[PDB]
Design a protein around this nucleic acid. Sequence first.
RNA 1: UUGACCUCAAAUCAGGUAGGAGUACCCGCUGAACUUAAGCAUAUCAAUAAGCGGAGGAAAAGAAACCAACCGGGAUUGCCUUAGUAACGGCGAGUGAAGCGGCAAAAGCUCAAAUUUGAAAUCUGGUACCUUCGGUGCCCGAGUUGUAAUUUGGAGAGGGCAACUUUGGGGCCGUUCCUUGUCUAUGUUCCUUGGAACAGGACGUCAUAGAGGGUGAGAAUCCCGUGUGGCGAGGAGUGCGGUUCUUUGUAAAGUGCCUUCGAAGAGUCGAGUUGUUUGGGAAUGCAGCUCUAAGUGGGUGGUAAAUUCCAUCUAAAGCUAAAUAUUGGCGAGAGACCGAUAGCGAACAAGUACAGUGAUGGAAAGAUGAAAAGAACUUUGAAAAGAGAGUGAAAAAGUACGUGAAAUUGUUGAAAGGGAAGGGCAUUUGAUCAGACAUGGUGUUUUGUAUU
RNA 2: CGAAUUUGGGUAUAGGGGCGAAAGACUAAUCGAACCAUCUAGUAGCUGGUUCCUGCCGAAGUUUCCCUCAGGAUAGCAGAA
RNA 3: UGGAGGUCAGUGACGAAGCCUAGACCGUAAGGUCGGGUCGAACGGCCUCUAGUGCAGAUCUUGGUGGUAGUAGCAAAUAUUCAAAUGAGAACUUUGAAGACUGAAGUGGGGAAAGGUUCCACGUCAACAGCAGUUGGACGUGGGUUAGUCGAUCCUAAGAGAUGGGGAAGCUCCGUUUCAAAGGCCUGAUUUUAUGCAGGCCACCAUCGAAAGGGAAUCCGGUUAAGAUUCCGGAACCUGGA
RNA 4: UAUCUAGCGAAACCACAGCCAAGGGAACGGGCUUGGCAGAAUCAGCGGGGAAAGAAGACCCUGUUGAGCUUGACUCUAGUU
RNA 5: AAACUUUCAACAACGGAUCUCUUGGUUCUCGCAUCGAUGAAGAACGCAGCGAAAUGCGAUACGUAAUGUGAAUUGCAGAAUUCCGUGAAUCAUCGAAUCUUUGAACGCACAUUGCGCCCCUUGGUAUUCCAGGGGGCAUGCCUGUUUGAGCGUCAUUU
Lengths: 206, 145, 119, 125
Amino acid sequence: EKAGHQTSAESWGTGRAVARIPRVGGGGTGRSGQGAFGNMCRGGRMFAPTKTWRKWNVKVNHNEKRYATASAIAATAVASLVLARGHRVEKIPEIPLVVSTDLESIQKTKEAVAALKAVGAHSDLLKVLKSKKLRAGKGKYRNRRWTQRRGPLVVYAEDNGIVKALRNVPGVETANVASLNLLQLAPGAHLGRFVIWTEAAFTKLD
Amino acid sequence: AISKNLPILKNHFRKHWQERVKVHFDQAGKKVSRRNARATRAAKIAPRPLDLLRPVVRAPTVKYNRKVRAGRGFTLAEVKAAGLTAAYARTIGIAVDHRRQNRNQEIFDANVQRLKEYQSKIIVFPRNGKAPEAEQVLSAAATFP
Amino acid sequence: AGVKAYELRTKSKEQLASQLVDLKKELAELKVQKLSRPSLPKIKTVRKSIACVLTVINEQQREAVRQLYKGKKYQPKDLRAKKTRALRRALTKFEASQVTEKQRKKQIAFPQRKYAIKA
Amino acid sequence: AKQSLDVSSDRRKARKAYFTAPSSQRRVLLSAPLSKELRAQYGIKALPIRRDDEVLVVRGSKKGQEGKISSVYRLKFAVQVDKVTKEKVNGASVPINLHPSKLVITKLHLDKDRKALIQRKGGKL
RNA sequence: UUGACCUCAAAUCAGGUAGGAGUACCCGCUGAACUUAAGCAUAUCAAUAAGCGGAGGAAAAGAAACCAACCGGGAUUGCCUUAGUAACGGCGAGUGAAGCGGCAAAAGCUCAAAUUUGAAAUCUGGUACCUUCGGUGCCCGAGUUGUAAUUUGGAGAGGGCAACUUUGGGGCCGUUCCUUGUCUAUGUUCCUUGGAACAGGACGUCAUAGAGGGUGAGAAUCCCGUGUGGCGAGGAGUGCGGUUCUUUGUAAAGUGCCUUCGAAGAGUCGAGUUGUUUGGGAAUGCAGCUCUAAGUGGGUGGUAAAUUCCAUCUAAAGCUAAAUAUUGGCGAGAGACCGAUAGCGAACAAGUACAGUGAUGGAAAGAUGAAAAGAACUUUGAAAAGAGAGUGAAAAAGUACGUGAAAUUGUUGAAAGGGAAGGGCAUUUGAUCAGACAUGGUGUUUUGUAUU
RNA sequence: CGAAUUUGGGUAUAGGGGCGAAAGACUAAUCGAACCAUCUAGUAGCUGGUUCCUGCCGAAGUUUCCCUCAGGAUAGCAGAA
RNA sequence: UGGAGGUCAGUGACGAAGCCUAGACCGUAAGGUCGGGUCGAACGGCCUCUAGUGCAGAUCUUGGUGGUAGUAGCAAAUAUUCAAAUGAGAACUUUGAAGACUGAAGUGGGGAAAGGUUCCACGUCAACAGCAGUUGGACGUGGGUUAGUCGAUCCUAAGAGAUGGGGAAGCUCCGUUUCAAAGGCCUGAUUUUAUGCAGGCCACCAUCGAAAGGGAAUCCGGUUAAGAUUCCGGAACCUGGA
RNA sequence: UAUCUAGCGAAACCACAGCCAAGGGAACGGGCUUGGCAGAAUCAGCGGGGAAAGAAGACCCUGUUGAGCUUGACUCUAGUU
RNA sequence: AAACUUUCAACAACGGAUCUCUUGGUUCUCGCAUCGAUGAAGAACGCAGCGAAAUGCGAUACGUAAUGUGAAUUGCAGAAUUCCGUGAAUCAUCGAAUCUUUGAACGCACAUUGCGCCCCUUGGUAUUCCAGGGGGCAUGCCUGUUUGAGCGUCAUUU
């Protein structure tokens, strides 16, 4: 809030063959007699300084959110939209894909990857793994160094180690049927997420 | 300064509001801290229910005359009718209000019944007993809606 | 090498004073050598040894006066706690815990009960 | 991924800690791994390097080069090993810094502190 | 003559305390103007900036001389709302709360005014010990112009009877956590480029660990770490079941009927003026001056004044965590932030160099290379340096070093030139360049007819 | 050019104040109100500037009121839906 | 154009970004794509989100660079010349020989304020000495300032300024002897004591304030790269004490 | 001194630049139109022109911009009575 | 067709733009409460084998003591038999010390490195003079001790 204003600059006025911009004065520095207090000046403040009370979070209707979530779920059901989103579902026997209490109560990441291979999301695992790439901006030193695709979303009803196993499994996200975030039901506002359901998850969706 | 057909607005922004702006970025942090403090207090008073028993009290004005809510504490007359003392009730967690008065038989009876139900619903552990842990509940307000 | 604090503590006060005076003499001789020579760290070694002897003497003297003042109030201000000015002005634990007879009787008669709600 | 709230995933913070770590933290950083035979003998994968160990450079322009460390330049974040030098064209030998992560240890200079360290890590000697 | 008491002194008397720093927040005092009103004086800015005094981790406030007018609520504080509303305002510009309601947090209380009067039962201090944040004994002193116990209005005290119920201590075994320390997974296997593999290609392994960083390029598996778990030390300390141990015995507290009482804060309340302030308007609060109370009295009940009722509290004395604050200090985690003229003035020996008598003002300034391996040696030159070498992946990285734009310069060279140059339309000349004839065609004299 | 002289040092007078044999003079190259920092990014109906392309449409300097006459509101002209 | 969510399992050390290029293609254009050089580590297309998002000007800000232009100019203070030496190199350095000037209210010999090592020696010319430099008040390294008598220190002047005390909400103001209970040295009793004592008098009634006022006392000769009324030799004096 | 050399070496100013006559034009052109003309590179002067440079005219007007000063302006105020 | 402007399949200059990077800032959130007469914050001098600055420290001076780790520091030297250890370290932790002149700053003053007084000890054939070492002497307030003053006022006669 005080950037560009930590000076006692005062305009020289007219009659001195210089622009009327305020000038830090004094002497013996090189900063003396130098323009200040302006977006056009070096060292001055910017135009319309950025403020913290800008709007950051935007309110949304609950019914609108639920409509979007239901549309995302139905788009997940639609098989063409998953291919359009590019989720390597050309090998899945049919969509939606339902697994059972074995995957619900799975415990180790090795058997998690094995179950993913059995069902057909191992291609998505490889997609994410080979898609991990460096960013193309300043996020690399702003703590967003690498970018990668999104893998399957395994949705469950009860947590018995599935979350931890598929948590270390790259790309794959896990969700509870109670929450079912739109943020991964349609990443990047693109419909057709690859979602792996369980039987309990299907009944809880009901 | 004034222009086409528009409502006349009264925006009180002729002071240094930019210095006096408070933005609640800490909503989530405050909620987390409040839940953490509630959990810590519950652990500190592990058998106790984290809440005092509040009486049933009628809202004052004619706008809210229809509604009933929670008061501050039970009257001394209500405590006497329940059959104990104000200090004892304060120790066992009944909120006691000295300045409230009982001029309504319905409210008197409702609060006396609340006190009786609370007494039948609690178990005061003896000072030098076996300490029979009793699986605390976390809300007397929820236990006696 | 440098003398070590444990044998400095083992040795007596006369030995400590003699060692200190010999260390000062060696410092003077070594400093003349430094004036006559380009570079040498034995002067730092000797200064460290002098510091060790001086701190051993200081700690033994402070321990002696502490044992002299042991058991009695009004200790010298260099021996009492240096915690903080505010902490020292603050009430002691006994003073803070002190309560009146009325409040003591009230607390004894009506403490906080350990009640619970199950059924 | 990380799960604790006392560990930071900040690149700037991590680099600051690395570059401003003290001498002991630097020793822990310049910890180095043992060879296959050494690991089979003891049961330890990596150890903080020492001055008088024996190291086999297995990565870099001097891959597969045996020697013994001459110094552990914690300030330079490397180790200097004898027989691994550069010949300044005036005819001088200047040590070449090699990273302990790139080298491998083929012999342990064992004192009782190192033996206790192996025991704590879970070695068998 | 000798002892006191009261008041006031003096001691390098014995022991203590205050100052100052610090402003991010907090409690007050003092206090503007620029500005807006399209002028300007009330107003606004603003009960703000500047100045002054005073604390803490929070402060302040706080358990009603409250809000209300209801079937009443019930300390304080904060949020949503009330509400840009009631109201104030050259009724213009503008300003502008509070009750109720939902929620967060909830904690309640204690002094004065009482004869202990069958025993000042109270306390500081000095000595002597001890189990030393203190205890015990003794002796001075303070104190009867009042120190204990007992009571704080919600009550309570003194008496006459009533079936009762509750214990006391200083060290541990584990207890939010503080200082923390340590241990626990898996490739550096093989080919290609490269100076370096951390890149690409095969085979793998671990994973409650594929967060991050470093290593000669983009590394889960090379290192530190990360995930889950064990263990070891030094603490403020009640989160209690058992603790090494004599019996506190008339002893404190609560309670049920009655009887008599029931003390409750004064130059204060209140009133009149003056000034300031407030939304408070025949005056909201504060303060100066004048007058000056009462005891079922006194205050309030948002229109000034009689008179008659009602409702609600109990001032002129005091303490108290939490929810709240947070551009300061300490520690930590992050971001759709900035990226060396940006971001703090300061990424760097930055409040530095420097200027001013002084208050004060206040810069510029990052990058060789993976590694100095920082150019040995010969020669010209007085020397600086040059040429040749040498190191390096690169010297088109050589202190004046990552890349090295433009302005502005010297030189390969090309064209033009009678007091400007540049430009448009259109050709010519010179220079230079893309497009296009193996394109999906003949069936057999040439062939390099499963290739046509 | 022996004095109402000249001058060093130490002192006192500080900003609406000082000092002035009086010029609005001097008060650190600043004086018809110094300098420093802050309020302050003071206000400005008044100057200056206001950064990519193409397509379509496309004006007004006139009415009324205003301490209004270098400005606004209003109606008119124009665009879009 | 800078960032963000998706996707291209997109491009890349066999060369990304960037920059240069009267080379090419496309779009009416904003511009995009490619060819060739330099370069060495990241970057892009598509669907969306977002903004500190587009420069020719503002006597715009900061930095850099021109024509003018090898130009104006380097002309006050009378003035330089010959030889030698040293040096790569001499109008400028040193030595000698001439010629001159300041002409004792100096261009001499010291000091005050101020400066702070500029003093001196030895090396030494990258920058500075608006020409040059072998020289320097420049650069590098070192040396140098010696007091009982000279000053400060002591006194008080103009004045400043605590205390008692009184104002001010307060930072602080007044006041300096005023409406204050304002106080230290001598033969000393001569031996366990003790400026407690058989004793004595007063009256400035803090302090600061002058390196030119007042004031206790040192001179000569010699000595160094530089210090001397300070060192040395000689000859003295003052204060305090015994 | 200027001038020419050896060494050293700035600044003002600069939309682009630099030959005229008339015309018209914002009513006094270096550029536009018509005509006169027009030949590299330059040196010393020179002061007609560049409506030459120096400064957001200080004269005048406007602003609902000030300030110094005055008073029998409006509204107040220290002091005094 | 010489010398004097434009453009390079072109170099070399001047200059530091762009690109890439970042132990730095800026905002957000969370946790905690800790300055000083037991002398703070801030100054001024000095301390390293070679230091001018910066860091740290105070004549015990780039540090002493204690604890932990375990074999360094490194620009060049220096003691590597300390390296199976009561032990390197420009290490970490940090509880004992030291802490020059100052500074609220305290004996009085302060443009003085000025001027006092008290106590003890030592030396100068010394209680007084000088010197050396050590310990002290501020003000405003509170409680207490001692010594006092006041026909303020009680007990009221040699």
